[PDB]
Structure formats: C-alpha cells, structure tokens
Design a protein around this ligand. Sequence first.
Ligand code: HG
Ligand code: HG
Ligand code: HG
Ligand code: HG
Ligand code: HG
Ligand code: HG
Ligand code: HG
Ligand code: HG
Ligand code: MN
Ligand code: MN
Ligand code: MN
Ligand code: MN
Lengths: 339, 339
Amino acid sequence: AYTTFSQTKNDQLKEPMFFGQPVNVARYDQQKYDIFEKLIEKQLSFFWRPEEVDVSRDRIDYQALPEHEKHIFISNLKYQTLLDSIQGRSPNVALLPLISIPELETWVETWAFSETIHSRSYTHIIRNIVNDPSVVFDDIVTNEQIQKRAEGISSYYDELIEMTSYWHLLGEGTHTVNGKTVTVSLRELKKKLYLCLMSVNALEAIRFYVSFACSFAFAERELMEGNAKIIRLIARDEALHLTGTQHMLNLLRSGADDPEMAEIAEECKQECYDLFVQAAQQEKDWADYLFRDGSMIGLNKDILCQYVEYITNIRMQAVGLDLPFQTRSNPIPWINTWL
Amino acid sequence: AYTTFSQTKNDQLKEPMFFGQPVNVARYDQQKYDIFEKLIEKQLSFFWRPEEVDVSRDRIDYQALPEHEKHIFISNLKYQTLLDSIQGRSPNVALLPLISIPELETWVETWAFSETIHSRSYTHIIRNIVNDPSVVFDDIVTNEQIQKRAEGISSYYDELIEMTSYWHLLGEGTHTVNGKTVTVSLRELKKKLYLCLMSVNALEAIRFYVSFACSFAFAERELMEGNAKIIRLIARDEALHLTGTQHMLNLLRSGADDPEMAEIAEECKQECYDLFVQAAQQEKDWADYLFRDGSMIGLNKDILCQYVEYITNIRMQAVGLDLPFQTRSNPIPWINTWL
Ligand SMILES: [Hg+2]
Ligand SMILES: [Hg+2]
Ligand SMILES: [Hg+2]
Ligand SMILES: [Hg+2]
Ligand SMILES: [Hg+2]
Ligand SMILES: [Hg+2]
Ligand SMILES: [Hg+2]
Ligand SMILES: [Hg+2]
Ligand SMILES: [Mn+2]
Ligand SMILES: [Mn+2]
Ligand SMILES: [Mn+2]
Ligand SMILES: [Mn+2]
C-alpha cells in the first residue's frame, strides 16, 4: 500500500524513479539524477505572477477582431486552459503515488504547481477581454470539439490512476472483486505509466506548441500583446516541462533506471509510435476548426498543419523514433522570436 | 471513479468542498469561498528562495554549541524536516482526489508546493552546518523518538488515502475482495477525512509552533541567526496554512458546506477533542527528549511544556472546543517578535 512516510531506511540514490519504496525524507543534498534538481531550481527561478502583466489593451484588440479571428483566438485560449486545467492536477494525482526518489517527487509538485499559475493567467486574460467569462469556461467543458482531445487525454490518466489504486490495495496477482476476476500486473502498470509519460510528453512538446504558434501569430500582427507577453512566460515553463518528461522517457527506455521498463519500452514500440501519430493528427484536425470561417495573416491550415508535422518530427527525434513526416524545415521561423 | 477532467458541465459554485464532482475547468474568476482565492494570492506573494538566506555564520555557532545544545537544535530541525517531508506530498495525494471546487484544489497544490520549499530550506541549513548531512537525514527515519509522532501522522493520511481508493474503485456499499467483506461508506469517508483535516490542523497550528519556540530561543541568544531568518519565512507560511485548515474545519462543522459533515462533526466530537489532547501530549513528551542532557537559556521543559498548553488552547478555541488546559498566558511573549 501507499504510505505518506515509509518507515524503511532505504538508499534513495539506488531506488528506481517509479514503483520503488515511497519517498520518506525530503532531502536535496544529493540525487540519483540531478536533471530533476536542476529543473526544480530553474522552475523556482522562473516564478512569475500573471496579475502583473497588463492585458487591458487586449480587450479593444479582441473586440476589433472579426468574428472569425475571435474564433481562432478564443478557441486557442480555451484549448490552452483545458490542457493546463488537466496538467495542474494530473501530474500530482497520477505520478505522486508512484515516485520513489525525492528529486522527482518534488519536481512533479513544482511542475504541477507551475501549471496552476498558467491556469490563473488564462483566467486573467479571459475575464479582462470578455464580458461574460462564464461563456468561455463552460464551453471548454461542452464544446464537443475541445472534448475530442480532452477525453483522450484524461483516459491515459484516469486509467493509470485507477490501476494504481488496485496495485496499492491488492498487490500483484489475480483477484476477485465481488465475483469478478481482476488481474494486477506490475509489468502492466509499468506500461500504463510509460504511455501516460509518452502521452504527457506529446501534450507538453506538441499540443502546447501548436497553440503558441496560433497565438503568437496575433502577436506578430501587433495584436493581443498582453497575451503574447503572458504566453511567452508559459512557453519558457513548458520548455522545462518537456525537458523533464523527455529525460524520464529516455531514462526508462535506456534501461538505466529499471531494465524491466526498457524491455517494456522496446516491446511497446508501435504503440508509443502510433500514439504520437494520433496526437499530431489531432492537432491538424484542430486546425480545420480554427479556420472554418476563414484564416488570417500569417496563419491558415497549410501553415499550421505544416508546423504540426515539423514540430512532431522534432519531439519524436528527441526520444528516438523515426520522423513520422517528411524532413522539412520551420514553416514559421518567426516563432523562435517569442521562445 | 476519479477523473482528471469530469465531462459534466456542473455549477462549481454549488459543489461541496469535498466528495462532489471532480473539478474539471480551472477558473479563478469566481469562487464559492473566496478565502481560498485569498490564500493562494497570499502564498504566491510570499514566495521566497532558501538559497538566498546566508547561513554560513550558523556553522560556527552550531559547532561552538555544547553537545546538549546541539541535541536541541538538530533534533528540532529533524522534526521540522519530517513534518514538511510529510506535508510536501501528503496534502496533494490525500486531498486532491476529493476536492470538488477549483479554488480549494489549487490552494492545496500551492500549499503542498510551499512545503517543498521549506523542505529545501531545511536541506540548505543541514548541509551548511554539518559535515555529514546523511547522518541527519537517515536519523529522521530511524530515530525512534522522531517516529513516535511520525507514525501517528502518516496513519491518518495513509488510512484516508487507502479508503479513498476503495470508494473510487468500488463505490458505496458492501463488497468482497477475494473472499473478504469490505464495506465502503460515504459517511465513514467524510469522517476519516474530517479527522485528517483536524489532525493536519494540529500539525500546522501546534506541532510547528512548538518548533519555532524551541528554534527562535536560539535566535534570542543571537545564535543560529541564518536559521531564524529562514524559519521566520516558514512561519509566515504555516500561518497561511493553518488559516486554510481552520476555515475548512469550521466550514464543515457549520453545516454551511455539507450538512452530513456538520452532523458527523457533532457526532465525532470526543475524538476530535481527544485527538488534540493526544497531540499536545506528544509535543510535551518531545520536550523530555530535547532536554535529557540539560536545557539552555530561555528554554527548558516547564517553559516549552507551558507553551504547548498555551498554544494548544489558542488553536482549539479557533475551532470551537473547550480549552483542554488552564487559561494562562504566553510563557514566552518574545516569540511574537519573530512572527
Ligand atoms: Hg497521461
Ligand atoms: Hg492553434
Ligand atoms: Hg516508445
Ligand atoms: Hg502539412
Ligand atoms: Hg491527516
Ligand atoms: Hg522544540
Ligand atoms: Hg470536532
Ligand atoms: Hg505545563
Ligand atoms: Mn502550462
Ligand atoms: Mn506543462
Ligand atoms: Mn512547512
Ligand atoms: Mn504547513
């Protein structure tokens, strides 16, 4: 079972990142993988307050915008708000119960914490450029187009969480819950997790960047500059986040942390691969919705769609996987300005 | 079951703090209880970095100290490190899966986050005033005197967590896990939680303050002033934390949030009461250990023991309970200096 303070005096330097002995003492004078200590120190130094950024000038700009340019902006903001709504709570609930080294535990809490700040920044934008914030928030939940990907994201999480409870309550082996066979495999858990980790990596490394492009496009036209300033700070963070997930995944597949993982990584190769292809495809389809009533300067389907592929190829490379798309270059190199 | 993003478009202003629909959208443009929005804003504004505080001068002071004055200092630091080791992870794991209003969710993540910063500050002190930090950390786990209260604290948590898994996996009603009857009652969960909440309140409101007294005593003698500076920042935070737990408990017993709770609050009156008496007693016994080889100026058993009672009476008053002790005054009014 899970314990908020394991009684055993284990060597934290020799525990796996996951599934080992729950972390007891929170120490930071040493670590198994200092990338996590570095990320924490970096996240702490990037601390920023949303309320500070003046978005008052964005209300007029947003209003001026045509009903189809409002669609793009607000729709993209709604998606960002969704992602971080998830990410704020999710890494804590899903990963915290499985960490076994102190640096990763605290990194995840720091990481989740920073996502709540982003959520707040979104509330800061929305309530300052619209007269009925409730319309925006409620639609995030109802908007069936936002939910297509919203439901796919929370399943990897929900399923990992639910299967983690069984493991802590019953243990490995086959059980019966009210006349129902329920099998609990550690090798299966390590896979369920590996997939969330890979799915979380695509969310941080791809989903969010597709949103900064179709966000800074406005900043390029000198529109919504309060928002651009805020999303510049969020991108700096999401960069830390993707560095963390990338290190986790590459530490797992390298058998450096836990061989059984590495094995499950090679075996679960086509999934991890078709998992990304699914994500990229979902970001492209998203584009058809943002431009159903016309595009704008510097951003249309072909532009975005092309960025999705370019970006997806970059992210999978970082985790050793064949570029699912042609090997082209940045359709909007200007984006590097805001990053 | 628990979901990282509930599909239902509920009214977050009319959900109970706990056990209602998991929070979906993270919004901050309104809230059921703005005390939580206030705490978040306050915690965010108190953000501080431990590394900043120069504790270099504390190494000499600590060394100079007699072996019995080292006992006091280091033992008290070890206890603080334990508490925050727990608090860093615990509120997230135990409470996050049960919150149903956005402000409380984010407050808890902010609250847990701030505790990790405290853990770091402790690592910052320890590795700067001792030559073998490992000795200190390992003892936190082994030291059977630290574990007396360490085991009692993690049980309320562990038990609530474990019983929350069953509720999400099976639901209310009687079940059978491999030929074993297992009952899951919502009214029982609401109680298990109510007790952690009350036990967490004593940990923030009493346990931690007993440690600031037997910590600033050194600052009073112009010793360990780097540490005093750091613990001044931690106390400011623990004050926010106790304000939060106090509001939760008093919102629950007032039947304002959920009547069934209020009912379970009146019914579970002697426990909540004997729960505190147990804590206070544990802090007093702690004193016999800090002074087994002699006390120091401004701090001995009678002094401390008397503070424990004075403080305990203050905390229970704030949550409507009879002062378990005589109604006296502050045995060390100087402590208000550092707070
Ligand atoms: Hg996931
Ligand atoms: Hg976009
Ligand atoms: Hg893979
Ligand atoms: Hg394309
Ligand atoms: Hg508790
Ligand atoms: Hg003390
Ligand atoms: Hg009570
Ligand atoms: Hg006393
Ligand atoms: Mn974010
Ligand atoms: Mn992120
Ligand atoms: Mn603390
Ligand atoms: Mn606290």
